[PDB]
Amino acid sequence: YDLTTRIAHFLDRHLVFPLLEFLSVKEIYNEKELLQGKLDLLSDTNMVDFAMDVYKNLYSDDIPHALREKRTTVVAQLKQLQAETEPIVKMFEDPETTRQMQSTRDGRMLFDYLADKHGFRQEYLDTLYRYAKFQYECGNYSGAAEYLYFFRVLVPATDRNALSSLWGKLASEILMQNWDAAMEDLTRLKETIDNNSVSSPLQSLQQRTWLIHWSLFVFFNHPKGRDNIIDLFLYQPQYLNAIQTMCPHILRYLTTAVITNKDVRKRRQVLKDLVKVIQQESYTYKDPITEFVECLYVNFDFDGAQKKLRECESVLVNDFFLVACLEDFIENARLFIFETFCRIHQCISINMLADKLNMTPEEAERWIVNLIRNARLDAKIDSKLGHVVMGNNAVSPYQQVIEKTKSLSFRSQMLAMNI
Amino acid sequence: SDLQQVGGASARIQDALSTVLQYAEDVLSGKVSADNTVGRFLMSLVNQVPKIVPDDFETMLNSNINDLLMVTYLANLTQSQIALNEKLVNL
Structure with missing residues (x-):
C-alpha cells in the first residue's frame, strides 16, 4: 500500500510529547496495561484515564506524570499531590505565570469586545493573532479557546495551527466532558484531513491515531464513526504496518458495532479483510483474549469454544475502558457463536447449552425461542426429549436454475418475433 | 406398445387357461398335470414381478418414478x- 512504504523507512519513530515513559511495574491484565501505555503516549497524556487506571488496580505512579502539567487545572493537580503528601517544594512557577496570564486575558478581553463591536477586518485578525499566542500558551481558559475557535480558527500559517487547535480543543473538551464540543471537533477533524498538508510520513500517521482516539471511547452515535473510520483510508484493522502495531483493541469495538447495528452477512468480509490481513496477524499474537474470539469463530468449535468465551466474559466484564455497550457486546457474542454453530447443525440439547454457559434449562429454552422469534434460526423443538433439531437439507436445486435459464431466453425469442 | 399388446394378449390367454384348468377339477376331475407345475410357474412370475411387497419398496419405486420423470423433464x-x-x- 502507498502510505505503508512511507512508514517503511521510518520504523516507529513517532513524535509524541511524553516521549516514551509511562507508569511502570503494572500487574493485572498486562496486554491492557501495555495498551494503556501506547495510548497515553499517542494521545499526548491521559489524564482522566489515570483515575480509571488506579480504580482497576491500586497504583501510586500516576502522581509521576500528574505533577508535571499544570494546564489541566493548577488547583486540581496541587490538591492531588498534597492529598498524596508529595513534598515537592517546587510550585512557584504558577503564581507568577497565572498572574501574567490574568493580565493577558483581560488586556485581550477589552480588545475582544471592541473587535466584535467594530467588526473591522484588519482589527479582528490582529486581535485574533494577539489571542492565538495566549490560548496556545494556556487553554484553561477552555471556553475562551472555544469562543476563539467558534469563529475564525485560521491564522497566517494556516495548516499546522488549525490542525493543532482542532486536536487541542478535541482533547481538552473530551477531558472536561463537554461532549457537544468533542462531537463538533470529531466532525471538524475528519473534514480537515482531505486537502491535506505537506503529509510528511509521521504527520499522516498521527492524524490516523487522532481519529482512533476520538472514535474509540463511545459517548453518543459512535457506530456512525465506526462506518466513517473504516471506509476512510480503505479498511484496515490497525492502520499501520512495520511490525510494532498494537492499537490493539479497536477491532473488538468495531466488530460489536457491526453486529448490533447491521446484519452479520457481512462478518464474512470482516473475517477476510480485517481479521486475516497481516496487520491483524501481527496484533492477534499480542492479545490472546482477542485471539480466542477470532480463532474459535473461524474453526467452528462447539464446547472448547463456548467455555473459553464464557472465561473471556469474566475478563471482559472487568474491562474498565470506556466502551458504553458492554453487555450488548457480551450477549451478542453468545448469540453470534450460537448462530454460527447452528448454521450447519443437526441437533442441540437444551440442557447441554445450559450446563455449559451456567444458565437454567428453561432460560436456555426461552433464549433459543428468541433466536427463532427473530428468525436467526430455522428449527423444530422436541417437547418431550428437550432437544432443538434443525433440518435445512434442501432437496431439489433444479427449479431455481430452470426459472432463470428459460425466463430470459424464451422472452428474448418473443422480443425477436416483431420485425 | 406392440410388446405390451402381445403381453396383454398372452395374459388374457393365461386368465382363460387357468379358468379352464380350475373348472376341469370342479367338473369331475382335472388339473393333475397342472398341479404343483403351474403353482411353480405362477410363483416364478410373482417372485420376479412385483418383487416382494412392503411399503418401503413401493415408496422406493415411486421415488424412482419421480427421478425417471425428472430425467424425462430435463430431456x-x-x-x-x-x-x-x-x-x-x-x-
Whole structure:
C-alpha cells in the first residue's frame, strides 16, 4: 500500500510529547496495561484515564506524570499531590505565570469586545493573532479557546495551527466532558484531513491515531464513526504496518458495532479483510483474549469454544475502558457463536447449552425461542426429549436454475418475433 | 406398445387357461398335470414381478418414478434449449 512504504523507512519513530515513559511495574491484565501505555503516549497524556487506571488496580505512579502539567487545572493537580503528601517544594512557577496570564486575558478581553463591536477586518485578525499566542500558551481558559475557535480558527500559517487547535480543543473538551464540543471537533477533524498538508510520513500517521482516539471511547452515535473510520483510508484493522502495531483493541469495538447495528452477512468480509490481513496477524499474537474470539469463530468449535468465551466474559466484564455497550457486546457474542454453530447443525440439547454457559434449562429454552422469534434460526423443538433439531437439507436445486435459464431466453425469442 | 399388446394378449390367454384348468377339477376331475407345475410357474412370475411387497419398496419405486420423470423433464428442457439455440441461428 502507498502510505505503508512511507512508514517503511521510518520504523516507529513517532513524535509524541511524553516521549516514551509511562507508569511502570503494572500487574493485572498486562496486554491492557501495555495498551494503556501506547495510548497515553499517542494521545499526548491521559489524564482522566489515570483515575480509571488506579480504580482497576491500586497504583501510586500516576502522581509521576500528574505533577508535571499544570494546564489541566493548577488547583486540581496541587490538591492531588498534597492529598498524596508529595513534598515537592517546587510550585512557584504558577503564581507568577497565572498572574501574567490574568493580565493577558483581560488586556485581550477589552480588545475582544471592541473587535466584535467594530467588526473591522484588519482589527479582528490582529486581535485574533494577539489571542492565538495566549490560548496556545494556556487553554484553561477552555471556553475562551472555544469562543476563539467558534469563529475564525485560521491564522497566517494556516495548516499546522488549525490542525493543532482542532486536536487541542478535541482533547481538552473530551477531558472536561463537554461532549457537544468533542462531537463538533470529531466532525471538524475528519473534514480537515482531505486537502491535506505537506503529509510528511509521521504527520499522516498521527492524524490516523487522532481519529482512533476520538472514535474509540463511545459517548453518543459512535457506530456512525465506526462506518466513517473504516471506509476512510480503505479498511484496515490497525492502520499501520512495520511490525510494532498494537492499537490493539479497536477491532473488538468495531466488530460489536457491526453486529448490533447491521446484519452479520457481512462478518464474512470482516473475517477476510480485517481479521486475516497481516496487520491483524501481527496484533492477534499480542492479545490472546482477542485471539480466542477470532480463532474459535473461524474453526467452528462447539464446547472448547463456548467455555473459553464464557472465561473471556469474566475478563471482559472487568474491562474498565470506556466502551458504553458492554453487555450488548457480551450477549451478542453468545448469540453470534450460537448462530454460527447452528448454521450447519443437526441437533442441540437444551440442557447441554445450559450446563455449559451456567444458565437454567428453561432460560436456555426461552433464549433459543428468541433466536427463532427473530428468525436467526430455522428449527423444530422436541417437547418431550428437550432437544432443538434443525433440518435445512434442501432437496431439489433444479427449479431455481430452470426459472432463470428459460425466463430470459424464451422472452428474448418473443422480443425477436416483431420485425 | 406392440410388446405390451402381445403381453396383454398372452395374459388374457393365461386368465382363460387357468379358468379352464380350475373348472376341469370342479367338473369331475382335472388339473393333475397342472398341479404343483403351474403353482411353480405362477410363483416364478410373482417372485420376479412385483418383487416382494412392503411399503418401503413401493415408496422406493415411486421415488424412482419421480427421478425417471425428472430425467424425462430435463430431456424436454435440453431439447427445448437445443431448440432455443436452433431458433436463434435460423433467422
